[PDB]
Amino acid sequence: SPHWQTKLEAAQNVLLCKEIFAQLSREAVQIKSQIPHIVVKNQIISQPFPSLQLSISLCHSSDHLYVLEHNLHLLIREFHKQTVMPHPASAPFGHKRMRLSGPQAFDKNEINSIQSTEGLLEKIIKQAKHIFLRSRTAATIDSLASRIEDPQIQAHWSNINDVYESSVKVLITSQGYEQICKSIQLQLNIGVEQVRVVHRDGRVIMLSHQEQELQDFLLSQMSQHQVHAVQQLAWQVLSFSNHVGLGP
Amino acid sequence: RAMKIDHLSIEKLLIDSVHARAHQRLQELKAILRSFNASIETALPALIVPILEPECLHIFVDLHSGMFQLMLYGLDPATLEDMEKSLNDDMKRIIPWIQQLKFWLGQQRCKQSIKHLPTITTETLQLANYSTHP
Amino acid sequence: VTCVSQMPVAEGKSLQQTVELLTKKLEMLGAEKQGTFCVDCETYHGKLMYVMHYPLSCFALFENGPCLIADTNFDVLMVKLKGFFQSAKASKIETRGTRYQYCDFLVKVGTVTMGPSARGISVEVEYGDCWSLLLEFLQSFLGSHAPGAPTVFGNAVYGPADTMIQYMELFNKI
Amino acid sequence: RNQQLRALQEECDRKLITLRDEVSIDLYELEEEYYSSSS
């Protein structure tokens, strides 16, 4: 393999890395008060919320790999967009989104479709999504280890993992009973805000960063619904069983 | 504290200076709180002011300017921001926002408590006609 | 999409008093602050000088008016054909007001353009026919008013500018 | 060279996506087999 060629390639790589590091530094110093952060000559770290010590750092001779590739691809896509053709006829030399406001009236859509903030914020909220997924996995593991004698809850992740959010479908999954499928919680986790979960009622909810007791409450009430359904399975005791009457 | 390194980096000098002045004003605010109330917490990058006595309302400082904004793991944007802007501009009107945040936690706790059960909250009945018994 | 709009010309107390009462009723309904998209209403004509703005303005000459270009292009076309049109000299009025988005429903209060005028209440639909919720809100919002009935429900797809021209046609009303 | 490398990266992306789909079927199967038993 050519040696000077890959040397020149790595040189271009470190040059663009220095450029993007300067850009992220200028962004962190010129940004508003959205979040505090730590900027050093070569090491950067932010804190959008407690227990978020994002360890991104510019190294030089003087997850662990995916997030940096993502950042590089997003910044180079940003530059590429800064360079689609404007399809100019008289002299637009812009983007079709600008001229779309003429025929199609956009009160705030055109403002949102023009340009937005990115760079450090997008990587930060991606790490937020990551830590949210980690907390969800930890809650599931804690339920499995603790509520073992309890009905073993069973989860399944989605497949189209977007740039910011994802989802998981979870169910009670009583021991050897497919007819006990009385509640199915779909959780769409995102770093933008709290996760919104719906089981069977459209009850849009929002937990906290360390709030997980809603899972146990759903577990209990679904255990109740399950004993109701299996009683419907074997006499015919009617549906007079409610959730909680005045609190025992 | 009180770092006096020999030109390791001018950035390090800015860190030392801003960290010192920020810890100074943060201890000042902590003393103000202790003058009003009777327990708070402190950390290295910023400090924490408690609002509940059993985890939100965390204060922090701009490491490159004044106007030390605040942010909580809560809600109410464009209003908390205005409160912090008025705080940075005045530094006097601080306890009314403390009581506002007290009311805020009081209402958010019950809202989140009643969210899972079938309920519909609201500000007021909006019917003050029979304004005798209530 | 293109929702109805009318102007209940109230009296008794005052024009500004009626505007304040309507605004207070809307706030009691829960009208959230959404800026002030003051939509002017100027006349020079059978063309027109519509300056209503909805982050773009245009004048409807006829056939409801194409007016599909940005405001700058329209103003440049007007200044270029200075006199080459048949529509400079009529009264150039300008209506104003605030726009509040209660919940997926924006309401705008077109005030007195030249000073003699009413406060037209303009609402905005989401998808659009579709008068069930429209009427349910109009009856709960005002009294014996808001007839509307624009050149809608005929099927050329939710035309706002034709409605705006119809509203500006209220110039001869006073 | 542009067209050649575009085809190369398209083939690579296709292979990676097929890998993801197969691993997705596999993870669904193994997760269903695992959650059916609690130690």
Next chain:
Amino acid sequence: EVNTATLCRIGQETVQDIVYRTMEIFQLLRNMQLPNGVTYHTGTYQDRLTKLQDHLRQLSILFRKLRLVYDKCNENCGGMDPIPVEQLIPYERREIVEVNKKLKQKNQQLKQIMDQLRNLIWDINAMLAMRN
């Protein structure tokens, strides 16, 4: 080789399967339209005919096994025949327990292995999120 409790569980599962097969044969009988309707001349017709033939053969074998297990449960009444604990419901084993403990330990090990595997799978999904 008693397997009596397993035999009763098998009989319960067999009657459940009989009910499910009844549901299935009804759901496959409802969609049996006229032969020369549009195109299903004999192909799908004879296909579902053989399908229901196998269904009925399997159901007959299941009824045979149900009769057999019922006769076995009846003949199983040996020693402590009355056993009045039915109405009186309440209100070595060491080797088996040790084998169960070792099995649960191996299961926890395999659970950690599956956790690592699904972590890698989520990572790969993240990579694909970065794809074009």
